[PDB]
Amino acid sequence: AECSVDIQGNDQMQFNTNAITVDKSCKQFTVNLSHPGNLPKNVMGHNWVLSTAADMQGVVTDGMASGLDKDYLKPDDSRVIAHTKLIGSGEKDSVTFDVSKLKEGEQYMFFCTFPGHSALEKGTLTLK
Template sequence: MSANRAIVLIAGLFLFPLGAMANDCHITVESDDQMNFDSEEIVIDQSCEEIELTLKHVGDLGVDTMGHNIVFTRAEDLESLAQDAMQASEDDYVPAGDDRVVAATNLIGGGETTTLTLDPSLFDGDERYAFFCSFPGHWGAMQGEVRLVN
């Protein structure tokens, strides 16, 4: 490599840091048989055209006994939506047509994975958002904050 090419390459690394060249538009969250998410925060990068959110259930128990999903809602609606979701068993515990639901993954059991494509424009920067598992009894332990970044 010539000296001039090396200088251009080094200068390019300082002018365009690797982190600035790609957005974090792919998110993976794991859940388990002990009613845990591996993250208490999901970061939504609003500069992404879309975000691919993958939920992995790393446990062994089936969807009927230890099902998990991720439901996004405004923080102020979390408790009331979680209470109402327990009655929505025919809809995988996500009340159909409920405007408090911003987005939701499918309900999965141990060893399963589901992916949701999110439109970041669903999240208003002036609101606070939360996520939770709507399977009955899980939301108290399985919830977290959504942080919006540009």
């Protein structure tokens, strides 16, 4: 779309994109996450979580420390630019955030924090 992207996480631990370009015209950006498949949220939950590339691992590690009731995310983690909820199959969640939180030239990663899953469920996001 524009100033937005629909992303899907499937039953095989994959997002259907690995690269998002955010048009610098946009004042806000919206991610619409959905989960086609049958698998439930405790086995195959997906979230879409954005951080700088440098911050991704600490976010993933502390998200694992926080656990499933915290949607596998440290509450108020200052390094998380934007995140959806964790969703199961057939569910949908959107997050919108201010584009002024990003800058050109910097490297951002989006990823799911379900334990173990970010090895596959990840990609890059750039402002251009």
